[PDB]
């Protein structure tokens, strides 16, 4: 019972918001990430890094505000406030996009603090640490998208800017430049997300519709008691319903709930790997056999060749303003267009 | 062809800027989150019925009457991960929330497409921010529009004879 | 030489066979287009 | 179509190798007492 054990006593007190040792990392890093985002979206411009207004103070709404990435000439600079770019000037640091790296780094260490908190509480309450393990998927996504992706690219400029429309641009950029929908790792991510949402909806509806009558109310929530040993719904009835509707059904509740962990976690991990490839421009952009055939046969058309024409439109129309460090002047006659439009 | 449908739909309707698709995204992201959350919390609180050399799933028998996990321990964990009143202690309320969140969101996503069918499109903030002289100050919404224009001018590149794509 | 006592039998039930074969065949259905390119 | 010349064997082994791994493990499970 030295000073360490006395400090360990206080950090793990049963209070309203648990602290723990992880709370030393989680709480300041998460609050600065959140507070940095709310600060930038309320007050900070993107005029010098992107040529964009991006705060409420400039006139943007909630959908259009962002803490935008630094200028492409920053490279992968950490953009520390005391670093050689800002040199301690907070105002210049904000104008250089120093808030973006502030949010991304405090957010990264905050996420590390959150998984440590999951591990710490699970160890203290005596449960298995599967919630910490499932949280590795959001960590893999944040690390691949906001860190590994721009680190493979020219600068932090091409990471997502922390904002709603800014994120939508990032989606459209990945379509037009990376053809990211064609990527099988993204497709595995889509199956994990939509499968997990299916599993969320299907499991919740099945439980709620195979409930045992454990009370007289027509509003059935009161008939559950948190200390009951018994199942509140009929696994046998649920199993027979789905076996006859759909052909298969869960018969093991433990496997069912593991599969609910597995599906969206595996999906997000799969999507992270595809983005790691896109950090190097290792895209699933084309199918070579279709390109050889289309180049020699001008009647050969698929939805895939149609999507590449859309991709070429996206690149030529968006690049001069989306990449204003390149100083793209595309004269109007060079622009790919269809007839009339 | 699905991806072609999506890209053209964004070009013509700005679906990303429609709140019903955004509610739809919150449905499926939330559904996937809550799937992983409910799966992990139940798996984390499974009652020890097996040894180390066997799968834990054999600890559950089909049709047994006792519950196979400790919901009080799971609530005790999750109520300390966030705070106590953010965590469900009612499994019926929990499972209704698991049904209700993705379903309502996907309902809204369906009404997104179905009302963009009648050309009530997502939010248009093109040239919304203007300086003191009148210069357009671009936002991220104007960058979205530049991508939308490139999809618009290239889609069905032989099909349009007149300057507006009206349907 | 006496047997090794650390040995354990291995199992894979039928549902795990069906799940794995579903996973392998769907992954092959997904990736085969990219393997052919 | 001018497809990858190794794509057929890459697909055939991608199926057959883990499929037979599961078949081996399943059948030896059923033959246990």
């Amino acid at each position: 019972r030295g000073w360490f054990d006395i400090l360990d006593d206080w950090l793990k007190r049963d209070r309203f918001v648990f602290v723990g040792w992880s709370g030393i990392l989680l709480f300041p890093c998460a609050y600065l990430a959140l507070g940095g985002w709310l600060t930038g979206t309320t007050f900070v411009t993107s005029w010098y890094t992107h040529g964009l207004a991006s705060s409420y103070l400039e006139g943007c709404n909630f959908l259009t505000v962002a803490v935008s990435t630094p200028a492409n000439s920053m490279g992968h600079s950490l953009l520390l406030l005391w670093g050689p770019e800002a040199q301690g000037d907070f105002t210049r640091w904000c104008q250089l996009g120093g808030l973006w790296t502030f949010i991304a780094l405090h957010g990264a260490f905050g996420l590390i603090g959150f998984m440590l908190r999951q591990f710490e509480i699970a160890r203290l309450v005596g449960v298995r640490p599967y919630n910490a393990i499932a949280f590795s998927a959001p960590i893999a996504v944040f690390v691949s998208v906001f860190l590994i992706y721009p680190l493979g690219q020219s600068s932090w400029f091409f990471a997502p800017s922390f904002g709603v429309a800014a994120i939508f641009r990032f989606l459209l950029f990945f379509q037009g430049f990376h053809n990211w929908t064609l990527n099988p790792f993204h497709m595995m991510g889509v199956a994990g997300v939509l499968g997990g949402a299916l599993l969320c909806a299907i499991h919740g509806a099945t439980v709620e519709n195979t409930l045992f009558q454990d009370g007289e109310g027509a509003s059935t929530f009161r008939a559950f008691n948190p200390t009951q040993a018994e199942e509140t719904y009929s696994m046998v009835t649920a199993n027979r319903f789905w076996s006859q509707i759909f052909g298969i059904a869960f018969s093991n509740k433990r496997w069912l709930h593991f599969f609910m962990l597995f599906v969206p976690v595996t999906g997000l991990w799969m999507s992270a790997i595809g983005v790691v490839g896109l950090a190097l421009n290792l895209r699933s952009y084309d199918f070579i056999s279709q390109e050889i055939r289309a180049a020699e046969d001008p009647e050969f058309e698929t939805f895939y060749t149609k999507n590449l024409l859309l991709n070429e439109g996206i690149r030529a129309w968006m690049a001069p303003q989306d990449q204003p460090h390149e100083n793209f002047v595309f004269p109007e006659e060079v622009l790919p267009r269809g007839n009339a439009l | 062809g699905t991806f072609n449908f999506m890209i053209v739909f964004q070009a013509e309707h700005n679906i990303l800027m429609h709140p019903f698709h955004q509610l739809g995204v919150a449905g499926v992201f939330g559904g996937a989150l809550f799937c992983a959350m409910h799966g992990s919390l139940v798996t984390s609180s499974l009652i020890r019925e097996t040894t180390e050399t066997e799968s834990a799933n054999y600890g559950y028998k089909f049709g047994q009457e006792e519950e196979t996990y400790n919901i009080v321990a799971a609530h005790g964990y999750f109520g300390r991960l966030i705070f106590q009143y953010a965590s469900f202690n009612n499994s019926r309320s929990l499972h209704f929330f698991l049904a209700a969140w993705p379903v309502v969101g996907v309902w809204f996503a369906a009404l997104g497409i179905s009302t963009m069918a009648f050309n009530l499109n997502g939010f248009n903030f093109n040239h919304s921010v203007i300086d003191a002289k009148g210069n357009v100050i671009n936002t991220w919404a104007d960058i979205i529009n530049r991508a939308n224009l490139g999809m618009e001018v290239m889609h069905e590149r032989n099909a349009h004879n007149f300057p507006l794509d009206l349907a | 030489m006496e047997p090794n006592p650390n040995r354990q039998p291995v199992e894979l039930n039928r549902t795990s066979l069906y799940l794995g074969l579903l996973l392998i065949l769907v992954l092959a259905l997904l990736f085969s287009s990219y393997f052919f390119n | 179509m001018e497809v990858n010349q190794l794509g057929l064997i890459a697909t055939a082994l991608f199926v057959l190798v883990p499929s037979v791994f599961l078949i081996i493990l399943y059948v030896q499970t059923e033959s246990q007492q």
């Binding site: - | - | 085969s32 | 055939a12 199926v15």
Partner: peptide
């Protein structure tokens, strides 16, 4: 060979559906 491959895998999946539904390990109440 490509078309054969894709149809083959598809047919194996559909066969797997048949065995997974009609020759499943029967869920037993115990």
């Amino acid at each position: 060979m490509e078309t054969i491959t894709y149809v083959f895998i598809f047919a194996c999946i559909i066969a797997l559906f048949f065995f997974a539904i009609f020759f499943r390990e029967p869920p037993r109440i115990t």
